Amino acid sequence: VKQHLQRETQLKQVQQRMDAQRELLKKGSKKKIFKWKKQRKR
Amino acid sequence: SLAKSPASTIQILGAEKALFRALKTKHDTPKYGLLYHASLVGQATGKNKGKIARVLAAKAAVSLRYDALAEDRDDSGDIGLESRAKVENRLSQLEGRDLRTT
Amino acid sequence: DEEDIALEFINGEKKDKLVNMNSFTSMFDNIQNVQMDTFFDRVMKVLT
Amino acid sequence: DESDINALTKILSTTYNYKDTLSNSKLLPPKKLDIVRLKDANASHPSHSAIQSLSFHPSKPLLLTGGYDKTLRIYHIDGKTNHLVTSLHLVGSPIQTCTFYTSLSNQNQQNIFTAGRRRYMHSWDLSLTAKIEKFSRLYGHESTQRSFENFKVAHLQNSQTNSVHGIVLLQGNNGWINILHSTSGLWLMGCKIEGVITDFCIDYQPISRGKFRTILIAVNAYGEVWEFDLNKNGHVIRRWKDQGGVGITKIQVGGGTTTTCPALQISKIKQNRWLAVGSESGFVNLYDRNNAMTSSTPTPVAALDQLTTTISNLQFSPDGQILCMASRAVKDALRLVHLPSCSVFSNWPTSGTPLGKVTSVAFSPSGGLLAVGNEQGKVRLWKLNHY
Amino acid sequence: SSLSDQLAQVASNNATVALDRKRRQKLHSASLIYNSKTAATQDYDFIFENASKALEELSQIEPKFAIFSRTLFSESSISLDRNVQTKEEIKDLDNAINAYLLLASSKWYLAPTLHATEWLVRRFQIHVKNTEMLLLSTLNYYQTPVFKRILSIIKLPPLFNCLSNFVRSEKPPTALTMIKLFNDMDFLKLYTSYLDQCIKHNATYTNQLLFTTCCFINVVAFNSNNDEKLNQLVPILLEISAKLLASKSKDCQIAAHTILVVFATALPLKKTIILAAMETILSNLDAKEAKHSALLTICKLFQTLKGQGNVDQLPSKIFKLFDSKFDTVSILTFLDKEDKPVCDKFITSYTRSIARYDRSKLNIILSLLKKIRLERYEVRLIITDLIYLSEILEDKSQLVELFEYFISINEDLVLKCLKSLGLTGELFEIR
Amino acid sequence: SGDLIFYDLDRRSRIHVLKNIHRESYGGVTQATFLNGQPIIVTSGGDNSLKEYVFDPSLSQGSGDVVVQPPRYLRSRGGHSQPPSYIAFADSQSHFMLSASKDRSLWSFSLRKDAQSQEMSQRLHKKQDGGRVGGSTIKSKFPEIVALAIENARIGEWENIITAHKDEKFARTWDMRNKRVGRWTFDTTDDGFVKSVAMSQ
Amino acid sequence: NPKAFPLADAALTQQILDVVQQAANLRQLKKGANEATKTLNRGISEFIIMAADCEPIEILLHLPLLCEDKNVPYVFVPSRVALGRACGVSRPVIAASITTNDASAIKTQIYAVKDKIETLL
Amino acid sequence: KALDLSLKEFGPYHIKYAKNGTHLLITGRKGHVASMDWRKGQLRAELFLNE
RNA sequence: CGUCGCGAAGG
C-alpha cells in the first residue's frame, strides 16, 4: 500500500509537470518572471 | 448516478473498451459510443456526427440532470424540446458550411 | 433655444435593431411549406 | 414602340443616388465613421511624460494638457497648426489629473484645478506672470484623504437661494467621497459608501426654470452604486445594483451635460440620458435613464465586450451620440461605439491608426475635435466630419 | 486569336449532336430517372409512352397540359429531331420548352412530373442547350434528390459556376452556397428576368416566392456593411419589388413587402423613394393579409428615416389614398395590439397630415394620441401645427379638448411652443 | 458631373452607370463616343485623360441581351491636368522622361510612341524592421514636388531617383524600375525645408 | 430561489469573486459545470462556486450531491454574468472549481475564503 | 458546320480534308500545322514550327 | 503641505 502511495505521488508530479508543459503552449501574452497578461479570452 | 456525470462521459458512455485500450496504448479515443444510435448523429454527415455527438451529449447532460434532479416538473419536456431545437439549428448551421472553396 | 431643439431631436431617438451577416440564415430551415404571412411576421420578429 | 402603381419604378429611373447623404440627417450614420486626422496637438511644444489628462475650455479654443513631467501646458488648437499659449510648471508635484473650470453664474472666473498624487490640489485663475493657490486643508477630516489623486469639478445651486458655486469632489480612501468649495475651500459634506470608492460621476437634473439639483453617482468595487443628490445635504435617494459586472473601474454618465461639456447659461442645463459603467474585464454596461428611473435593479441596454483588457477612460460625445472606450493597457486599445443603436464603429480605429498606448481621451464641446493622448508623450487630434 | 478557343466555341455549339457511338451514349446516358446502365438501352418510344402516361396524370390533376399533349408530346415528336431544322423553328421550340418548364416548376414533388419532363430532357436535349431555364426554374427545390440529379446530369452554365463542387457528390448543396450564387448581380439580373416572366405568365407560387424572398434577404444581409454594393444592388431588388407588387396574389404581394422592409432597414433610403414605395404598396391592396402586412411595412419603412422631413406632411395624393385603403378605424386596433411595433414617426406624420388635410375628424387624432406613446420633438411639432390650425380656423370643442390634453401633459413644451409663437393669454383669449 | 450612364432604349432602363471617369472640376466627361459597329466607347474629359471602355458579350447564353455586363476598363492615355514642375530624362537612350507635375503626381512619359505613359504609384514599401509603414494609410497624394534628381548607374538593384517636396522636412526616393516609392526617406536632420537634391553619378 | 442553499452575502461574494479573479490570473481554476464535475470526481478541487441565476437550477445542483459525498466546500453566487466577467470568459459560466496547488502565490487568501465558505455549512 | 477558324498570326492558310469528311488539316505558310476535327471541337494535333 | 519601437476612415 505504501508502494502504491509513492506511485501515486510520482504519477501526480509527472502529470503536473507534463500538464504545465502542455499548458504553456496554448496562448496568452506571457512572460517568464510564470504569469499571464490579464486579458479575458474573448 | 447517471445525472452525476459530466458531458464527456455521457458522450463516450458506450464504447469504453475501445476508449480504455486507446488510452493505454497510443491511439485516439472514440467519440460516439452509445449515443451513435440516436436519431441526430445519424442525421449528420461526415465528422459533423462527431461534433453533433459532443453537443448532443452536452444537451443530454443538461436535460438529464434537470429531469433527474428537479422535484416539481410537469413532465411536459419543455427544456427537452427546447434543447432539441437548439441542437437542430446548431446542426443545420454547421452542416451549412462547405469546406470546398466555391 | 435652437440648439436645445436640435439636441432634443437627437436625444429622442430609440434603439434600432440592425442587420448583419448571418441575420437571416436561420430562415433556411423553416423555409419549406410555411404560409407567407407566417414567414413575414417571422421576418418582422427577426428585425424587431 | 411609343409616342407618349408605377411610382417608385419611375423615380428609380429618375434618380441614381439612394441615400440621404447630405447634412439633412442630424445623426451619426451607424457602423461607418467619417473622421480625418489633423496636425499633432503636441507639435509646437514637445511633452515629456505620459499625457495623463486632456481637457477643453468649455467656450474658448484651449486644449489643456497635463502629465507626470510636473508641468501643464495649454495649447490653442485648430486644423493646420496649434501653438502653446502658456505652460506653467510646478516643481516638486506631478499632476495625475488637471481640468478647466468656469463658473456658471458670472462666466469670468476660469480656474484650473490640478491635482497629483500628493495631498494638495492647485487652483489657477485665468484673466491674463500668474498666481495660483494651494488647496491643502481638509478641515475636519484629514484621516480620510490619503491623496487627491482623483477628483471632479461640478456646479451646485444651494436650494434656498440661487448662489450657484462650484465644487471639487475627491476620491476617499475607505469609502468616502468628500466635496469641497471651489472658490473658498471649505468643507461642505462628505458622503460615504462601503467597499472601495472606485470612481464617480456627476448628473444634473433641472427642477424649474433656472433651478437645478445635482446628483453624485458613485460606484462600489463590486457593482452596486449609490446615487445621492447633494443640493440638500448628501443622503442617498437611490441605490441600485449593476446587472452583472464584478471588477468595475470607471463610470461616466452624460448625454446631457457633464464635466466634459458643461453649460454657460444656467438654464442650458440638461438631464443626462446615457450612463456607462465599465469594468476591468473589458466589459462595458450602458443603460438609458428613461427606463432605469425607479427600477432599483435595471437591465443593461447594451453589454459591450469589444475591447479586451482593463478599461480606464470612457467618455461621451458632447451631444450624447458616441461613446469612447479606451483601455490603458495594450497598444492600440481605443474604440468608439455609436450610442443610440449601440453599434461599434468599424472603419476608423484600424491598425493603420497610431493611437499608441492610449491614456487619455477628450472630446471638444462644439467642434467635434477628438484628442487622444498616449504614453509616448504626445497627443494626436482627430476631427469628426459630422459635427 | 486562339484556335483552341475558336474550336471550343464550335464544341459548345455542337455538343447537342451525336457523331459517333461513344458520344451518343455519353449524350444519351444523361437521364433523370434511371442510371447509366439502364438508360443506355432505352429506345425513344419507351420513355415516350411512359411519359405520355405521366403527362396524362399531370393533366388530370392540372388542366393546362392538353395543349402540350397535342403539340410537343405528340406521336410524331419521337421522330422530330432537334438540330436538323431551321433556327426559327429552334427558337419556337426553345420558348416552347421555356413555357413548359415555368408551367411545371410547381409540380416537382410528383413522380408524374418527373417522368413527364424526363422525356424532353432525354429527347430535346434540354439538359445541355436549354440549360438555364431548367436550372433557375427548379432552383427552389435545392434540398432534393431531383435537384441533385439535375445538377449531376447537366453541365454548368458560367453564371452558376459556384455549384461546380456539387457534381458527382452525394451531399446536396447548401443554403450558404445558394446565397453565394445569388450574391453576384450578373446572376441577379437573369433571375429577375426569369421572375418577371413568371409574373406576367402568372405562375408565381408560394414555394419559389418563399425561396426568392429568403435569398434576397440573405443577399441584403451579406451586403449589410457594403455601401457601394448596396448602392449598386438597389435598382434590381427594388425594380422587381415593384413589378412583383404589380401582381395580384397575396403571396407575391407580401413577399415584395418583405424584401421592401428588409431593404429599408438595411440602409436609410431617400424620403421620396420611401413615399413612392408607400404609394405603390398602397395602390394595389386587395386581400386580408395584404392589409396587415402593408401596415407593418408602412410603419417600419417610414420609421427608418433619420433626417428632416422624417416627420413632415405626407402629401395629399397619397394621403387620401391611405385614407381610402386604410380606415382611420382599425389603425386604432393596430395601435391597440399588445406588442406595439415601433411606428412613432409614421404616426406623427399621420397626425400632422390629418390635422392639415382633413381638419374635420379630430376626435380620432385625440384618441390615437391618447393611446400611443410619443416622442418629444414629435409632440412639439404636432402641437405647433395644432396652433397653426387653431389660428387658421375657429376653436371647436374637440380642438380645445385635445389642446387641454396637451396642457394636462407637458406644460413646459406647449408653453415653450407658445413662447416661440405669442402668449398664452392671447391663446386663451382665442379659446 | 463626371458621370457616364448607359441607357437601354428597348427597355427604357439603365444598364450601367460609371462614376468619376474624368474629374468634375476640369469639366467632367466632355466627349464620349461609341464606334460604328463596335462595342467600345472612347471617353475624354478636360483633365487630360482618354480612356476606352469595352462592353463584354453577354454571359447568359439563352436570354442574352437583358444581362449586360458592366463595361470593363481598357487602354488609356493620360497627362496630369496641371502644368509640370520638373523635367528629367531617365535613360541615356532618350526614351523615357520623368515629369514632376503640379497636381502632386509623378509620371513617366515615353518619347517613341505614347503607349507607356504611366504614373509612379505612391504605395509606400514597408519599413524593414518588421513593423508597419510610415505616412498616410489613406491614399491622399504626396506634397507638391519641387526638385528631383536622376541618374542611371545601378538601376534596379536599389533606389534610383530621389526628390524633394514642397515644405517637407525630408526628401524621399522612388525606384525607376518598379515605378513606385522606395523604402528610405532621408531626413535633413536640421529642422529645415529641403530644396536641393542631387546624386553621385 | 428556494433550492439555492447557501448563497453568499455582499461582502463575501465580493471577496470570493476577487479571489476567483486572482485564480484566473494565475491559471489555477477550471470553469464550467461539466469541467467542475470532472475535477470533482478526480478530486483536485479546493472549493466550488456556483451561480444561482440559471433558468433551471438543476443544471448545476447535481454536483452538490457528490460534493457532499467528497466533503468539498461549495457556495452559490447570485449572478452568472458576474461569474463570467470574474472568471475571464466572455460567456456567462455557471460553476467554477479552484484546483489545488500548495505552491501558489494566493494560497492564504484561498484558504481564508475556504474557511469562510465551510463555516456556513 | 459553316465554320470560320480565322487565324492571323500565321500566314496564308491551306486546306486538306481527310479522305472521309471527318478530319481537317490546315497549314499556314509561316509555321502552323493543325490537324483537327471540325464538326466536333476536338483539336487533336496542333504544332507550330519556325519554317 | 516628508510624499509616493513604426503607424492621416486596414495590412
Q: Give the DSSP per-residue string, D98-159.
A: EEEE--TTTS---EEEEE-SSS-EEEEE------EEEE---SS-STT-S---SEEEEEE--S
User: Domains in chain G, please, with CATH?
Assistant: 1-121 (3.30.1330.30)
Do D13 and F137 count as a contact with CB atoms less than 8 A apart?
no
What residue type is B46 in one-letter code? G
D331 touches strand I (CB under 7 A): yes
Q: Give the β-pairing of D302-304 and D311-316.
A: unpaired
Do C25 and B89 count as a contact with CB atoms less than 8 A apart?
no
The Å distance, CA of D93 to C1' of I2, is 13
Complete edge-to-edge strand list for the sheet that includes strand H23-27: H15-17, H23-27, H33-37, H43-47
Nucleotides of I under 7 A from a protein CB: 1-11
The count of residues in chain D is 387
Chain D stretch 199-218, residues whose beta carbon is closer than 8 A to a beta carbon of chain E? none
Residue E425's alpha-carbon distances to E386, E392, E397, E413, G69, in angstroms, are 17, 18, 19, 16, 82
- Radius of gyration of chain D from Cα atoms? 22
CB E397 within 8 A of CB E405: no
* Subunits adjacent to chain H (3 or more Cβ pairs under 8 Å): E
| Helix pair E376-392, E344-357: axis angle to 10 deg | 0
The Å distance, CA of D112 to C1' of I2, is 26
Resolution in A: 4.0
The Å distance, CA of D117 to C1' of I4, is 7
Nucleotide with the nearest C1' to F129 CA:
I6
| Helix pair E289-303, E271-282: axis angle to 10 deg | 170
Question: Residues B12-47, buried b or exposed e (16+ Cβ, 10 A)?
Answer: bbebeeebeeeeeeeeeebbbbebeeeebbeebeee
Q: Strand, helix or coil at B52?
A: helix
D336 exposure class (CB count in 10 Å sphere: 0-12, 13-18, 19+): buried
- Tell me the shortest Cα–Cα distance from D124 to chain G, in angstroms: 41
The Å distance, CA of D91 to C1' of I3, is 14
* Residue closest to E289 by CA, chosen among E330, E317, E249: E249
Nucleotide with the nearest C1' to D137 CA:
I1
**Nearest-by-CA chain E residue for D17:** E231
* Residue closest to E372 by CA, chosen among E344, E402, E405: E344
- What cell was used for E431? 379659446
- Tell me the shortest Cα–Cα distance from E148 to chain D, in angstroms: 38
HSE-up of D336 (CA within 13 Å, CB side)? 28
D121 touches strand I (CB under 7 A): no
Do E11 and H5 count as a contact with CB atoms less than 8 A apart?
no
* Residue closest to F101 by CA, chosen among F84, F88, F114: F84
Q: Say how far apart CA D281 and CA C9 lie, in whole Å.
A: 35
D136 touches strand I (CB under 7 A): yes
Residue E268's alpha-carbon distances to A30, C12, D9, D346, G42, in angstroms, are 46, 18, 18, 18, 58
CB G52 within 8 A of CB G4: yes
- Tell me the shortest Cα–Cα distance from G25 to chain A, in angstroms: 6
Q: Which residues of E fall below an 8 Å CB-CB distance to C?
A: 143, 175-176, 179, 206-207, 209-211, 213-214, 217-218, 220-222, 224-225, 250-251, 254-255, 257-258, 261-262, 265-266, 289, 292-293, 296, 300, 304, 306, 341-342, 344, 375-378, 380, 416, 420
Q: Is E430 on the interface with B (CB under 8 A)?
A: no
Phi, psi of E199 (to 5 degrees): -65, -50
Do D244 and G13 count as a contact with CB atoms less than 8 A apart?
no
Q: Say how far apart CA H39 and CA H3 lie, in whole Å.
A: 9
Do C10 and D301 count as a contact with CB atoms less than 8 A apart?
no
* Residue closest to E265 by CA, chosen among E297, E228, E222: E297
For residue D363, give every residue at least 6 positions away whose Cβ sits within 8 Å of its Cβ, in sequence order, or none: D56, D260, D261, D315, D316, D317, D318, D324, D369, D370, D371
- The secondary structure of residue F116, as a DSSP letter, is G
Complete edge-to-edge strand list for the sheet that includes strand D358-363: D35-37, D379-384, D369-374, D358-363
Q: Say how far apart CA E175 and CA H30 lie, in whole Å.
A: 54
Nucleotide with the nearest C1' to D92 CA:
I3
- Radius of gyration of chain B from Cα atoms? 15
Residue G11's alpha-carbon distances to D223, D238, G92, in angstroms, are 12, 20, 21
For residue E13, give every residue at least 6 positions away whose Cβ sits within 8 Å of its Cβ, in sequence order, or none: H41
F155 exposure class (CB count in 10 Å sphere: 0-12, 13-18, 19+): middle
* Subunits adjacent to chain F (3 or more Cβ pairs under 8 Å): D, E
What residue type is G46 in one-letter code? E
Residues facing residue E321 across a β-bridge: none
For residue E323, give every residue at least 6 positions away whose Cβ sits within 8 Å of its Cβ, in sequence order, or none: E358
* Residue closest to E83 by CA, chosen among E151, E5, E156, E19: E19
Is it the case that chain D and chain F have 3 or more CB pairs lying under 8 Å apart? yes
Do A40 and G90 count as a contact with CB atoms less than 8 A apart?
yes
CB C19 within 8 A of CB E221: yes
Residues of chain D neighbouring F12 (CB-CB closer than 8 A): 13
Q: Which residues of G fall below an 8 Å CB-CB distance to A?
A: 25-27, 85, 88-90
The label of the residue with cell 452583472 reads D244
Say which of G34, G41, G55 has its CB closest to residue B61.
G34
* Residue closest to D332 by CA, chosen among D309, D314, D357, D312: D357
The count of residues in chain G is 121
The angle subtended at Cα E81 by Cα E78 and Cα E120, nearest 5°, is 60
CB D230 within 8 A of CB D237: no
Q: Is C15 on the interface with D (CB under 8 A)?
A: yes
Q: Say how far apart CA G97 and CA G114 lie, in whole Å.
A: 12
Q: Say how far apart CA E400 and CA E380 lie, in whole Å.
A: 17
CB E116 within 8 A of CB E51: yes
Q: Say how far apart CA E239 and CA F96 lie, in whole Å.
A: 52
CB E51 within 8 A of CB E115: yes
Phi, psi of D247 (to 5 degrees): -90, 95
The count of residues in chain E is 431
Helices assigned H by DSSP within G1-121: 10-26, 33-41, 63-69, 80-87, 107-118
Q: Say how far apart CA B29 and CA F73 lie, in whole Å.
A: 58
Q: Is E193 on the interface with F (CB under 8 A)?
A: yes
Do E157 and F60 count as a contact with CB atoms less than 8 A apart?
yes
Phi, psi of E355 (to 5 degrees): -75, -40
Chain E stretch 227-256, residues whose beta carbon is closer than 8 A to a beta carbon of chain F? 235
Concatenating the DSSP letter of every residue in D164-231 gives -EEEEEEE-SSSEEEEE-SSS--EEEEEE-SS----EEEEEEEEETTEEEEEEEE--SSSEEEEEE-S
- What cell was used for H3? 465554320
- What cell was used for D301? 441596454
Residue E88's alpha-carbon distances to E69, E84, F4, in angstroms, are 22, 12, 37
CB A39 within 8 A of CB D305: no
Do D352 and F5 count as a contact with CB atoms less than 8 A apart?
no
Residues of chain H neighbouring E13 (CB-CB closer than 8 A): 41
Q: Say how far apart CA D63 and CA D66 lie, in whole Å.
A: 10
Residue B47's alpha-carbon distances to B50, B52, B91, E176, E401, in angstroms, are 5, 9, 12, 19, 71
- The secondary structure of residue E299, as a DSSP letter, is H
CB E100 within 8 A of CB E203: no
Residue H12's alpha-carbon distances to D290, F150, H24, H36, in angstroms, are 87, 49, 16, 18
Do F132 and D351 count as a contact with CB atoms less than 8 A apart?
yes
Say which of E225, E306, E309 has its CB closest to residue D31.
E225
Residue B21's alpha-carbon distances to B27, D356, E43, in angstroms, are 8, 54, 59
Q: Strand, helix or coil at F194?
A: coil
Q: Which of residues 100-139 of F touch strand I (CB under 7 A)?
A: 126-127, 129-138
Sign of the CA dihedral with E260 first, then E263, E264, and E268 last? negative
Residues facing residue D134 across a β-bridge: D122
Is it the case that chain B and chain G have 3 or more CB pairs lying under 8 Å apart? yes
Do F61 and E94 count as a contact with CB atoms less than 8 A apart?
no
Sign of the CA dihedral with F136 first, then F142, F143, and F148 last? positive
Mutate to test the interface with E, among C16, C39, C42, C46 (most CBs of E within 10 A): C39
Q: Say how far apart CA B99 and CA D107 lie, in whole Å.
A: 67
The Å distance, CA of D311 to C1' of I4, is 24
For residue A7, give every residue at least 6 positions away whose Cβ sits within 8 Å of its Cβ, in sequence order, or none: none
- What cell was used for E191? 433571375
- What cell was used for H33? 500545322
Q: Say how far apart CA D148 and CA D118 lie, in whole Å.
A: 6
Residue B4's alpha-carbon distances to B59, B75, H45, in angstroms, are 14, 20, 75
Nucleotide with the nearest C1' to D375 CA:
I5
D37 touches strand I (CB under 7 A): yes
Instruction: Kindly report which amino acid residue has its CA closest to the C1' atom of nucleotide I5.
Output: F131
The Å distance, CA of D120 to C1' of I2, is 14
Q: Strand, helix or coil at B48?
A: helix
**Nearest-by-CA chain D residue for C16:** D341
D352 touches strand I (CB under 7 A): yes
* Residue closest to D214 by CA, chosen among D240, D191, D186, D187: D191
Complete edge-to-edge strand list for the sheet that includes strand D334-338: D311-316, D322-327, D334-338, D343-344
